[PDB]
Design a binder for these strands. Sequence first.
DNA 1: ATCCTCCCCTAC
DNA 2: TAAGGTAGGGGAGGAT
Length: 435
Amino acid sequence: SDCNFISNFYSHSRLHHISMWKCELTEFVNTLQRFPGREKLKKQSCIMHVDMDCFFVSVGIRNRPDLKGKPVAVTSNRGTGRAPLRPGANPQLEWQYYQNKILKGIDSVLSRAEIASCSYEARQLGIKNGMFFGHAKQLCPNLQAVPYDFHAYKEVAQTLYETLASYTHNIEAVSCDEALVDITEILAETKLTPDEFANAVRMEIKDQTKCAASVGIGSNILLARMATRKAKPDGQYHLKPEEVDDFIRGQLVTNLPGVGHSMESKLASLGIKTCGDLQYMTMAKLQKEFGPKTGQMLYRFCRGLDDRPVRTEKERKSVSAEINYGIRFTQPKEAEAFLLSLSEEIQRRLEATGMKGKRLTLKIMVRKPGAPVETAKFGGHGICDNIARTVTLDQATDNAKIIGKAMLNMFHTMKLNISDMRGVGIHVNQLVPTN
DNA sequence: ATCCTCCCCTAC
DNA sequence: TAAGGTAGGGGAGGAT
Ligand SMILES: Nc1ccn([C@H]2C[C@H](O)[C@@H](COP(=O)(O)OP(=O)(O)OP(=O)(O)O)O2)c(=O)n1
Ligand SMILES: [Mg+2]
Ligand SMILES: [Mg+2]
Ligand SMILES: [Mg+2]
Ligand SMILES: [Mg+2]
């Protein structure tokens, strides 16, 4: 049953989990705006970024001292690095497409399970988060596989924020294992050097989780995030003002928060690889080429300038639910049955968050023409494109029968081969809170 | 100029 | 096998 299929997918999805945890930690921090750790150590803006090292791995091997110091990966694959042969799939074509259009603008039995997190040992060999386990185990035959433990990560994630909250409420939740903290007040009250405090928080986090955090310190958010890169693993790095200009010039532009593979490829065609190359670009040229806001962001960031305060309050703008894995329909009756289920799921989330929406958007992934019907990854969406529809209701609703019905009307206007469908997503906008 | 609407992109 | 989600920023381009 599609009802059990949905529940079962979300049950096993790490990406669904990290998103929920982020949502929860964000709400916890918001709450704090409506300190045992400071007094227990009471015995020019300053920003600290706290980021746990190889978070799933570290938690996974907490109580497994045989795996410390080894190449380890958190993945679904039991450990062989093999999967059943998939004849008619074309891993080569999908990988080329991934390197060409996506990373820019025996193979047949290898595991295509993703590595969620890998140890630093494993990294010293090119294994990175998001690599297929089959391939990783080719780069490093001694890669150790470790199962997910979602309960344990949620517990460490919470312990992490509780700990930071014990020093200050001036926190921004970046993710489940990562927060920004403004420590200007603490340093003034305790009279401690930024480094002394950073060490203290690290010692305490390790004490309470058996997991290591790296800390980056700087006079703004951008600079604190970048210092963390240099701090990892198990360390800290204070990027002082006198070092900013020389540190920044050598950084690959891709390291700037907000520059991914698409922006990188567009900059490389401008002849720009490092932040230093970028500094030579005018504000007017960056805005013309990239738009006003992105243009300005690039100009400022490549200089180490950033004036965003720590955002302690975040308001929810949308609720959604997508599954782009294990979607295979043959009949329009099956697809419409599934749309009505995801509609009950979207009702639960709107309720759980106490919202109703006016604007409803259906997004379908469809197999791309020329792309093989048999996916390289078991259950994968493979190479696809997106069809999207949007409607707007007269009243904000949270009723699945109305949402379901809206999804069926939207789905009918699509020109679609059911057997090419590879993913479905419902997105709710223009929210209003209940009561 | 500001405001819509339909997307692409990015972070984790 | 394997579980490729989720929210928000913002550009293009068009109507107001
Ligand atoms: N491709 C990815 C990236 C991240 N996450 C999960 C696994 C990570 O353990 C956790 C935190 O991600 P980070 O980006 O902080 O990376 P790590 O903590 O694993 O390593 P690092 O030490 O580089 O921060 O989120 C995931 O499921 N899949
Ligand atoms: Mg981390
Ligand atoms: Mg996996
Ligand atoms: Mg992280
Ligand atoms: Mg970047």
